[PDB]
């Protein structure tokens, strides 16, 4: 209504960006051929945080044709090409009187109405991007975004004092985001070390001391071992005839293999529970069977006897992966020594390792890629800022 795009706190007002900007000028550095100037092009900007980080000092003689807009301390420069990339930055004082590409719209705050830092953060918002119509679907001969298009966008305008307060809150919030990323990185490192340390303790070299009552056994003693075989070609089908067939490591998923092809003549069978292990090319890699299935040349299946927990075996094989990864013969597998606690202690220790393993996995995923996390979290902060909610 009278409220504009959305309702602002008391005392704020809606204006076009241009209404709080000043005129800007151009200069041809080639007119002082022996004079160095500093040039800010698109490549000079880190779009993730909106900072001029790599401008180039250039001899006037060699000024690029786009090098014509004079920038001043506190200007915001806003690329009119691909605006969604956020090549948008605040000009520091060291760059006063230097030059940026004509590809930037130069937004110079009229300090009677707007703080440069407030304009900078405002201009990084999707709220501005989303107003630039020439960025949306284009028909024949539609012009690209112009400087006037940018100056014409609507912006919420608090009093100067509140602008400065909002700038401080936005910058502090963004710094906390960085702090958390660093912390996560540290946790990832320490948690991985924890897992590695825990496995090394419970899985000592054969013959090493084990708590009384544990025994060193050969896997063959507490595990049925089945070497996979290639059935006759022509017994494979996709009609669900027989059992899913897994040739080798390639046919393994994150934890369990997913059925792709069947074999009507199941030769070597693995059941739910059994651990699958690659005995071929990438030796030692592991999965667990979740369905009755059959295995080929590339796999062995290990079926724990009653004195051995599936997951104790799995952790051990994973811990041994570097050794196992130098084919693998039945006798090899049967001859592997494993320390064997009573079932209750295997389960107690597996519960502990499971907690760490889940934490390592979570920490791995919780670290989002940098450019995306920073740009989209920035946007969520700006949305709060420009509604008056900070």
From TrEMBL:
| Any coiled-coil regions, as ranges | 160-190, 349-383
* Record-level GO BP terms: DNA restriction-modification system
Task: Give one Pfam family.
Answer: Methylase_S
Alphabetical UniProt keywords: Coiled coil, DNA-binding, Endonuclease, Hydrolase, Nuclease, Restriction system
Which branch of life, at top level?
Answer: Bacteria
Question: Is the keyword Plastid in the record?
Answer: no
Task: Give start and end of each Type I restriction modification DNA specificity domain.
Answer: 11-175, 213-368
MF terms per GO, please? Answer: DNA binding; endonuclease activity
Q: How does it assemble?
A: The methyltransferase is composed of M and S polypeptides.
Query: What is the similarity comment for this entry?
Result: Belongs to the type-I restriction system S methylase family.
Q: What is this protein called?
A: Restriction endonuclease S subunits
**Source organism phylogeny:** Bacteria, Bacillati, Bacillota, Clostridia, Thermoanaerobacterales
């Amino acid at each position: 209504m009278t409220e504009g795009p959305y309702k602002l706190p008391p005392g704020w007002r809606w204006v076009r960006l241009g209404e709080v900007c000043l005129p800007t000028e151009r200069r041809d550095p080639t007119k002082n051929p022996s004079t160095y100037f500093v040039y800010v092009d698109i490549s000079a900007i880190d779009s993730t945080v909106g900072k001029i980080v790599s401008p180039k000092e250039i001899l006037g003689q060699h000024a690029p044709s786009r090098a014509r807009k004079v920038i001043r301390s506190g200007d915001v420069i806003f690329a009119t090409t691909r605006p969604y990339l956020k090549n948008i930055a605040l000009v520091p004082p060291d760059l006063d009187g230097q030059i940026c590409s004509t590809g930037f719209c130069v937004i110079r705050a009229n300090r009677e109405f707007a703080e440069p830092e407030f304009l900078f953060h405002l201009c990084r918002s999707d709220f501005i991007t989303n107003q630039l119509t020439a960025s949306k679907m284009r028909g024949t001969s539609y012009p690209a975004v112009t400087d006037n298009d940018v100056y014409n966008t609507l912006i919420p305008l608090p009093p100067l004092e509140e602008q400065r307060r909002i700038v401080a809150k936005v910058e502090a919030l963004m710094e906390r985001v960085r702090e958390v990323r660093r912390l996560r990185a540290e946790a990832q490192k320490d948690t991985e070390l924890l897992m590695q340390t825990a496995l090394a303790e419970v899985f000592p070299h054969p013959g090493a001391d084990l708590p009384p009552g544990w025994r060193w056994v050969r896997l063959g003693e507490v595990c049925d071992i089945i070497m996979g075989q290639s059935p006759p070609s022509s017994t494979y089908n996709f009609e669900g005839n027989g059992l899913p067939f897994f040739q080798g490591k390639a046919d393994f998923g994150d934890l369990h293999p997913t059925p792709r092809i069947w074999c009507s003549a199941p030769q070597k069978v693995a059941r739910p529970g059994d651990v699958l292990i690659s005995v071929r090319a990438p030796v030692g890699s592991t999965n667990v069977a979740n369905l009755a299935c059959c295995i080929g040349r590339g796999l062995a299946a290990l079926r724990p006897r009653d004195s051995l927990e599936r997951f104790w075996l799995l952790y051990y094989l994973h811990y041994l992966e570097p050794e196992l990864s130098k084919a693998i013969t039945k006798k090899d597998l049967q001859n592997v020594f494993i320390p064997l606690p009573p079932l209750e202690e295997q389960r107690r220790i597996v519960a502990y390792l499971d907690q760490i393993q889940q934490q390592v996995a979570a920490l791995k995923r919780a670290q989002a890629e940098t450019e995306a996390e920073l740009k989209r979290l920035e946007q969520a902060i700006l949305d709060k800022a420009f509604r008056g909610d900070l």
